[PDB]
Amino acid sequence: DTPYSYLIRSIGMKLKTSADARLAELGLNSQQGRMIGYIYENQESGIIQKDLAQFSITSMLQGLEKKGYIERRKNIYVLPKGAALVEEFNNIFLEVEESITKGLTKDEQKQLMSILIKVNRSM
Amino acid sequence: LMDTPYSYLIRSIGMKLKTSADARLAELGLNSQQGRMIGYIYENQESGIIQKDLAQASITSMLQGLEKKGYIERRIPQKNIYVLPKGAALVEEFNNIFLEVEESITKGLTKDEQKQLMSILIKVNRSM
Ligand SMILES: [K+]
Numbered sequence: 678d679t680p681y682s683y684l685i686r687s688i689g690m691k692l693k694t695s696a697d698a699r700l701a702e703l704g705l706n707s708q709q710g711r712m713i714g715y716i717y718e719n720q721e722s723g724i725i726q727k728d729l730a731q732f733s734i735t736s737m738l739q740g741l742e743k744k745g746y747i748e749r750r751k752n753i754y755v756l757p758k759g760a761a762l763v764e765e766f767n768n769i770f771l772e773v774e775e776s777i778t779k780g781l782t783k784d785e786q787k788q789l790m791s792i793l794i795k796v797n798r799s800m
Numbered sequence: 801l802m803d804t805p806y807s808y809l810i811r812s813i814g815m816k817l818k819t820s821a822d823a824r825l826a827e828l829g830l831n832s833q834q835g836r837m838i839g840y841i842y843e844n845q846e847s848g849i850i851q852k853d854l855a856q857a858s859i860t861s862m863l864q865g866l867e868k869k870g871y872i873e874r875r876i877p878q879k880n881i882y883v884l885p886k887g888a889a890l891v892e893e894f895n896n897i898f899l900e901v902e903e904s905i906t907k908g909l910t911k912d913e914q915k916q917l918m919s920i921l922i923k924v925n926r927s928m
Contacts, residue, residue, distance in 0.1 A: 678895075678899065678902075679898050679899065679901070679902040680902075680918065681902055681905040681906065681917070681918070681921070682817055682898065682901060682902050682905065684918075684921040684922065684924075684925050685810060685813055685814050685817065685905070685921070686814060686817075686818075687925050688810055688921065688924055688925050688928070689810055689811055689814040691925070691928045692807050692810065694928075767803070770803075770804050770807065771803070771804060773804070773807065774804035774805070774806055774807050776927070776928060777806045777807070777924055777928075778806075779927050779928075780923045780924060780926065780927035781920060781923060781924070785916075785920050785923070788913075788916045788917075788920065789806065789917075789920050789924070790805065790806065792909065792913050792916060792917045792920075793806065793810065793813065794809065795908055795909060795913070796809075796813055796905055796908065796909070796917075797809050797812050797813050797816075798908070799904075799907055799908035800813070800816050800817075800820075800904055800905075
């Protein structure tokens with residue numbers, strides 16, 4: 678009896694499947710991926726260990742250093758391997774996005790975009 | 801987040817619905833998983849529900865909590881789980897919250913847009 682909410686939740690959950698599988702193949706968790714992402718995003722501005730505590734973190738950074746994702750040290754920087762990973766995950770999300778229209782006709786593709794915009798605007 | 805436009809909107813709408821719902825439930829010291837669980841029990845109890853069927857957040861803890869608060873009981877027909885009247889009243893308040901959230905999805909849409917959205921979302925969900 679709440680079919681729109683059910684479909685929105687379920688599709689929303691499926692948007693994450695490919696990313697979770699890659700994290701697992703790489704031996705990383707969601708906290709590690711996000712941390713690498715956060716550092717990649719903010720390292721030019723400059724980020725220190727305190728900043729990551731407020732947005733252990735010591736042991737995680739050590740794990741990420743051992744995997745060659747983060748530079749050993751003071752500001753924190755991802756290594757090229759870390760930047761490459763962020764790019765990889767972005768591309769995963771692009772492939773998932775492209776899959777949304779797989780089962781849809783041209784008209785359905787346009788209508789979905791128009792309607793989702795309207796729904797999102799209304800709440 | 802806006803580099804993947806459909807995904808952006810789907811998650812934005814999802815997160816807005818969930819925030820609406822989590823907040824309206826939280827005031828009642830409830831959460832959506834408890835509501836779903838009680839609802840499932842209420843709907844299927846005459847079929848015979850055991851803890852195993854619910855397994856397939858700690859389920860044992862959540863069931864003990866619902867039982868301690870007087871919402872469900874375990875009856876000797878493995879014991880079967882049933883909603884008590886206080887729990888049936890609570891299912892209805894849960895359901896009404898979910899129904900108002902559902903209606904917020906379609907407020908701004910024509911009947912045709914509602915029909916198109918249902919049809920399309922079924923297809924998208926099937927395809928992945
Ligand atoms: K297609």
